[PDB]
């Protein structure tokens, strides 16, 4: 099969600036006639979409801003200017030989003005305590960039087991990310402590944002 | 102008399942229906095609004897049967009506197949109460995925954050935030709706102050 080598793996661009991704075929993707090279894009949690077929032909719907180029072993996809709604994973796909083959992906981040997470902490609810579990939920919304570190303190001691984190994909519309962190204990260990603290360390403030409650 | 694929599937290690992909606004003998596997935090694998005009099929060597493509050009539907399932078959499966003419192209919204020998467990829905203000609900310990959270039955959607389910204890846990102006609440009820088709459960939950 043909190894398709997408470069780079990751790409962060400001709105309005240009963008270019590369694709290398380990063989020429020109049959006898035209060259069956395609580009797709998967906007976050959406089926993939085909942008470009046959190296250069724009697929109905794609804006004039996109264009792809190449021949034989080398191909690139161009954007310029870049916009919010281009956030996605780009794939080069070849059809010159069965089995047809796919690049590894190129992940497109919109780079924007840094923004700090809006944070809130939520004590376990009564309804849950009655059942034996206790979960402290901390929401960390609308921040940029993605890399963010979250830390839980129970009565002043760092705590590491029980914490599950989950990130949304980059928001096509406002270009921020968002995060849940969730400290799950047992009702008795929850009752044994007093102070619960969720601390966001991000590139924004120096020291963390820290939401908290007592009891 | 839509391909619709069938709903999410949970099925046992060993069984078979059948995925459907139904067109509207074109006929599927004008295209090749392709199938494409997306393992979560990995690449698209191509599985092959069916030409619903001669019922020709071609599978990729990795999927032969694992995969059966069929098509019903009478109800304009394309089929992908997967056989003797394994953990490696846990993925999302898209059908693509696609053809280079001598073009134009459609994608289905995809079908999530989950290979587990575990059991349907409905969620527990927990309320999350504290310019503007943030509210949420916690959806804990259900199985399989998905669940869906809307807010006030869809009317609220602006400033809703809803996170990918995470696996732990062999069930999923997720949650949703919604941020409203603190005049709107609690002066006006904020409710979160939770659908778990797999257990046929629906939960409305009001966010009252503590």
């Amino acid at each position: 099969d043909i190894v398709l080598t997408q470069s780079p793996a990751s790409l962060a661009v400001s709105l309005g600036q240009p963008a270019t991704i590369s694709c290398g075929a380990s063989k020429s993707v020109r049959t006898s006639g035209y060259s069956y090279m395609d580009w797709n894009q998967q906007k976050p949690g959406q089926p993939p979409r085909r942008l470009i077929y046959l190296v250069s032909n724009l697929e109905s719907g794609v804006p004039a801003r996109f264009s792809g180029s190449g021949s034989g072993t080398d191909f690139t996809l161009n954007i310029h200017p870049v916009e919010e709604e281009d956030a996605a994973t780009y794939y080069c796909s070849h059809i010159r030989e069965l089995p047809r083959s796919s690049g590894g992906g190129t992940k497109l981040e919109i780079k924007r003005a840094d923004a700090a997470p809006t944070v809130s902490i939520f004590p376990p609810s009564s309804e849950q305590l009655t059942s034996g579990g206790a979960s402290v939920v901390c929401f960390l919304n609308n921040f940029y960039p993605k890399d963010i570190n979250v830390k839980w303190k129970i009565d002043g001691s760092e705590r590491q087991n029980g914490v599950l984190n989950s990130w949304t994909d980059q928001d096509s519309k406002d270009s921020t990310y968002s995060m849940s962190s969730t400290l799950t204990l047992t009702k008795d260990e929850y009752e044994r402590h007093n102070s619960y603290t969720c601390e966001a360390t991000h590139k924004t403030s120096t020291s963390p944002i820290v939401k908290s409650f007592n009891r | 102008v839509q391909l619709q694929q069938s709903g999410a599937e949970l099925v046992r290690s060993g069984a078979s399942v059948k995925l459907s992909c139904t067109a509207s606004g074109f006929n599927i003998k004008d295209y090749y229906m392709y199938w494409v596997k997306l393992r979560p935090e990995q690449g698209l694998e191509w599985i092959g095609w069916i030409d619903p005009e001669n019922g020709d099929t071609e599978y990729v060597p990795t999927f032969q004897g694992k995969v059966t493509m069929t098509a019903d050009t009478s109800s304009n539907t394309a089929y992908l049967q997967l056989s003797s399932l394994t953990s490696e078959d846990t993925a999302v499966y898209y059908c693509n009506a696609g053809v280079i003419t001598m073009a134009m192209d459609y994608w289905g919204q995809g079908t999530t197949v989950t290979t587990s020998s575990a059991k349907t467990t409905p969620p527990s829905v927990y309320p999350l109460a504290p310019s503007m203000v943030t509210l949420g609900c916690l959806v804990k310990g259900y199985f399989p995925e998905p669940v869906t959270v809307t807010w006030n039955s869809g009317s609220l959607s602006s400033g809703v954050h809803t996170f990918p389910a995470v696996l732990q204890s062999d069930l999923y846990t997720l949650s949703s935030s919604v941020t409203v102006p603190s005049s709107t609440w609690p002066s006006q009820t904020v409710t979160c709706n939770v659908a778990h088709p797999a257990s046929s459960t629906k939960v409305d939950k009001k966010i009252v102050p503590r």
Partner: peptide, 10 residues
């Protein structure tokens, strides 16, 4: 001419 198999149609 002749449409590449699996890929192109008249």
């Amino acid at each position: 001419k002749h449409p590449k198999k699996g890929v192109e149609k008249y």
